[PDB]
Write a protein that binds this DNA or RNA. Structure first.
Ligand code: ZN
Lengths: 155, 117, 365
DNA sequence: TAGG
């Protein structure tokens, strides 16, 4: 495999948005139990996006289970001049208040919740993507972002 | 919480080739929506014929309809009986404007990438 | 021996002798390694090159501050863009070329945008390590083709940074999709003219400088952006501030007019979730509004960024050696020996160019 | 002579 000391790796410093099915299939490294391996390429806080099948009002987090027709994976979505601030929230409180029955993106840390590849949201937002408008370019770059480096060997 | 469903070709779903039962995501143009059981009638045609899948929402009670619009349902498409394909709308979203055949093209590219291991 | 006062020259036409004139390998022209060598073994270099801009200035005195002896003739310095040219450097590099004006009214063809070859001009390296050229006793310059007439411009490519480990050997100017993750340092700096000293409400305190009366609005914003492969450090001054925020003319106007009163408000940022790292006022209302935005994807926008390396290939003294990492993915921080951040100056902010069919209910005001 |  690839030791932790074998990671000048770019995404070892940056986020990533990878194949949820192969993210499931991403080798949970035995060097540190919980970093995902896309043929051996480590991330710090991965990115996912998809339709949400599950929503539970937990103590600190929504429970957003995203599938993008690639596969399921679940997200512990940690519950997220000043006069004109009256209107301020009125443009981001919307994109930070989601219900069930649409599409949502999540990014953030990786953890292992009893056989589930549990994402833990460091950043996310409500999206108007349920139409999958971005989806053309999104999953045209997704096979590309896979075939480019991470699935391939590191150099 | 539910299972995943890919995008099989939208004119092979309602015919009986893809294994039904398991979760699936499919689109279809609303023509005569049913409100009681929340039954959409998604159409299916790509220059071949007119197949049709059905949609029966389960989880969300407040979901309305729209005239002349495709709908994406992700959920349980069981092995529905004669002339029917019901996808239990545990995920229910709208489709309009977006170039959908190109979407299925990218989906086929994804299925191609599935092989590159 | 000098030419005499009544002699005659004659072109022994190129069509007259052909033994060695067939091998007329380019009139002196130093090459890649030469100009990429802090100690080019000679005093004079020579190169093909094409210019993008020309600019003039006084022949300032060393350190800007010297004696009151005389006013030496205005040997006015001139700096010229050069898109360096030879066989190698397969992507367009650049440099500045300096020329003095002591006895040297510049030759013709010296326009931004022509084709010209030079020779026997001094290449050296500055106290600030920059590489440069100058004139000598054998200066050489000759146009190759007139500056054009079709002034069609050329924008920057559309790529992904999964190919850009190095700092050069690449489309130096480029563009790529990405998502902002943080700010770096914002300063709203209403300051004087000749010295740019702090002006509270638009009125300075050091004002002993000059009879200017209205301050200058130095607006600096600097961002941190992820791009799918690596990090992205970005800086901008006076142009990309209200846009990176997202304020229209009247909106950024009212912003500066509230912030007018202090004239100098500053924050520092270094990453996602990182709070104020400068010494702004915890009590001022604009501070709290600004940071309420600094905890929003409104300041972290997934957008397209235009970038070119900040430390020019004049002489890139490397920033810092590799460093360490103690950060968690899974349930454990893990260590390696990796490299620090980068310098990609922003060039044109491309906003959320994502699809427009997220809703056909866009807006009416 | 020649970057912040
Ligand atoms: Zn001042």
């Amino acid at each position: 495999e690839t030791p932790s000391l074998l990671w000048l790796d770019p995404v070892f410093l940056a986020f990533a948005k990878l194949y949820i099915r192969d993210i499931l299939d991403m080798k949970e490294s035995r060097q540190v139990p919980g970093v995902f391996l896309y043929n051996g390429h480590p991330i710090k806080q991965v990115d996912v996006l998809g339709t949400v099948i599950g929503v539970r009002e937990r103590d600190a987090f929504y429970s957003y289970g995203v599938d993008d027709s690639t596969g399921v994976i679940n997200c512990i979505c940690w519950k997220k001049l000043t006069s004109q601030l009256k209107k301020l929230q009125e443009t981001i409180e919307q994109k930070t208040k989601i219900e069930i029955g649409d599409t949502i993106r999540v990014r953030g840390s990786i953890r292992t919740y009893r056989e589930e590849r549990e994402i833990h949201a460091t950043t996310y937002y409500k999206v108007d993507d349920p139409v999958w408008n971005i989806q053309i370019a999104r999953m045209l770059e997704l096979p590309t972002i896979y075939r480019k480096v991470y699935d391939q060997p590191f150099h | 919480l539910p299972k995943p469903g890919t995008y099989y070709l939208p004119w092979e779903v309602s015919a009986g080739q893809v294994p039904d039962g398991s979760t699936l995501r499919t689109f279809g143009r609303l023509c005569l929506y049913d409100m009681i059981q929340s039954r959409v009638t998604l159409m299916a045609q790509h220059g071949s014929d007119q197949h049709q899948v059905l949609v029966c929402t389960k989880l969300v009670e407040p979901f309305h309809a729209q005239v002349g619009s495709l709908y994406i349902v992700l959920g349980e498409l069981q092995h529905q009986q004669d002339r029917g394909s019901v996808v239990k709308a545990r995920v229910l979203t709208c489709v309009e404007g977006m170039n959908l055949p190109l979407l299925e093209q990218a989906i086929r590219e994804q299925r191609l990438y599935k092989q590159e291991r | 021996l000098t030419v005499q006062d009544n002699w005659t020259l004659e072109l022994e036409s190129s069509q007259d002798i052909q033994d060695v004139l067939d091998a007329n390998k380019s009139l002196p022209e130093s090459s890649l390694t030469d100009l990429l060598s802090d100690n080019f073994t000679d005093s004079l270099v020579s190169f093909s090159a094409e210019i993008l801009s020309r600019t003039l200035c006084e022949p300032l005195v060393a350190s800007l501050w010297m004696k009151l002896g005389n006013t030496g003739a205005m040997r006015r310095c001139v700096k010229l863009t050069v898109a360096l040219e030879t066989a190698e450097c397969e992507f367009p590099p650049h440099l500045d070329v300096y020329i003095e004006d002591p006895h040297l009214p510049p030759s013709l063809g010296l326009l931004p945008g022509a084709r010209v070859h030079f020779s026997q001009l001094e290449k050296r390296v500055s106290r600030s390590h920059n590489v440069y050229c100058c004139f000598r006793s054998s200066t050489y310059v000759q146009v190759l083709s007139f500056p054009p007439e079709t002034t069609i411009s050329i924008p920057l490519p559309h790529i992904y940074l999964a190919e850009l480990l190095q700092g050069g050997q690449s489309p130096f100017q480029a563009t790529a999709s990405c998502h902002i993750v943080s700010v770096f340092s914002l300063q709203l700096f209403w300051v004087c003219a000749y010295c740019t000293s702090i002006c509270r409400q638009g009125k300075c305190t050091r004002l002993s400088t000059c009879p200017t009366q209205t301050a200058i609005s130095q607006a600096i914003i600097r961002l941190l952006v992820e791009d799918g492969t690596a990090e992205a450090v970005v800086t901008c001054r006076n142009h990309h501030v209200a846009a990176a925020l997202g304020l229209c003319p009247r909106e950024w106007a009212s912003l500066l007019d509230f912030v007018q009163v202090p004239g100098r408000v500053v924050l520092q940022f270094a990453g996602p979730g990182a709070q104020l790292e400068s010494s702004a006022r915890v009590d001022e209302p604009m501070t709290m509004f600004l940071w309420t935005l600094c905890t929003s994807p409104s300041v972290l926008r997934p957008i397209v960024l235009s970038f070119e390396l900040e430390r020019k290939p004049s002489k890139i003294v490397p920033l810092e050696p590799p460093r360490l990492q103690r950060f968690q993915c899974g349930e454990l921080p893990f260590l390696t020996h990796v490299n620090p951040r980068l310098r990609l100056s922003c060039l044109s902010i491309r906003e959320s160019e994502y699809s427009s069919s997220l809703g056909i209910l866009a807006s009416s005001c």
